[PDB]
Amino acid sequence: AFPSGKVEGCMVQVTCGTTTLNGLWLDDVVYCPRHVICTSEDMLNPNYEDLLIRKSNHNFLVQAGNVQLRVIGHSMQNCVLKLKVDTANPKTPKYKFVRIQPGQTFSVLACYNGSPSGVYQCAMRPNFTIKGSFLNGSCGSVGFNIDYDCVSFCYMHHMELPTGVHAGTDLEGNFYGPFVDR
Numbered sequence: 001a002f003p004s005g006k007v008e009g010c011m012v013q014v015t016c017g018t019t020t021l022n023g024l025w026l027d028d029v030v031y032c033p034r035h036v037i038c039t040s041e042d043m044l045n046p047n048y049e050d051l052l053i054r055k056s057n058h059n060f061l062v063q064a065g066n067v068q069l070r071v072i073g074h075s076m077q078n079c080v081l082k083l084k085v086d087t088a089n090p091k092t093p094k095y096k097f098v099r100i101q102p103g104q105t106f107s108v109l110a111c112y113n114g115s116p117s118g119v120y121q122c123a124m125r126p127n128f129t130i131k132g133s134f135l136n137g138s139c140g141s142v143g144f145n146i147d148y149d150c151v152s153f154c155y156m157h158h159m160e161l162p163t164g165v166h167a168g169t170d171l172e173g174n175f176y177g178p179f180v181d182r
Contacts, residue, residue, distance in 0.1 A: 002107040002146045004119040009091035012069070013114030014083070014140070015061040022111045022140030023062065024156070024171075026095060028088040030062055030069065031171060032140050033158045034081040035181040046182060052076050063114065064089075078173030079181055080156065094150040097171035102126045106154050108143040110134050122155075128177030129165035130157075142171070 014023040014032045018039050023032035035043070037051050037059075055074065060083055062069040073084030100106065102124040110118045110133070122143060124130050134141060134157055143155030157168045158181055167179035175181075 001119045001121045002144065004107070004109050004116065006093040006146070006151050007109050007142070007144060008116050010089060010093070011109065011111050011114050011116055012062055012064040014081075015063075016055070016059060020113055021137060022114055022142075023083070024140075024142050024153070025064060025069070025085075025089045026092050028085050030071075030083040030085055031080050031156070032083070033156065033169075033181065034076055034079050034173070035158065036081060036140075043182065048076060052081075076173075079158065079169050079175060080171065080173035096150060096152050098145075098152045098154050099170045099172075099174070100124075100154045102128055102176075106143040106145050108132070108134075108141055108155065108157070110138050110141050112137040124176060125165070128179070129161060129163075129167060131165050134166060135160065143168075 010025045012023040012025045016036045019036050023030040038046050057071045060071040069085040071083045072086050075082045105123045108120050108122050122130050141157045145152045153171045159167045169175050
């Protein structure tokens with residue numbers, strides 16, 4: 001597994017309504033699964049576009065440690081929510097977003113409400129799922145490779161599937177495989 005120190009300093013907690021999950025804090029932007037803006041009665045046929053319009057900035061509670069990061073904008077890029085905040089993360093590492101394939105390994109920093117609890121070497125199965133240990137709250141954990149001193153973020157966990165396997169996106173919000181957040 002890759003050492004996790006660069007990524008630990010980016011992990012945050014995002015809460016919307018009933019829902020709380022992990023966010024990734026880079027520069028003045030927090031990335032997290034967009035389904036954070038759903039109460040899961042919305043989870044049957046969500047209109048994310050109508051949902052995101054209905055939210056205002058104070059609807060989003062972002063905390064890194066016991067600092068609040070004030071959200072000053074919210075946009076959506078495919079399936080990831082992008083919260084603009086009023087401060088840039090002074091611990092932002094050199095980073096890039098990359099898309100990978102099943103079979104290629106990466107490390108995942110499992111967190112429970114912005115709090116890191118393990119780092120694990122994973123790969124997606126050919127059907128783009130991943131079998132590990134991440135329940136409610138570990139939603140939003142990200143995966144990465146470290147190449148020299150640059151963190152290539154390649155994965156964000158979004159959902160546990162009925163089979164127990166997990167589905168996720170890349171950091172541009174595009175799901176790996178045919179999965180949907182519905």
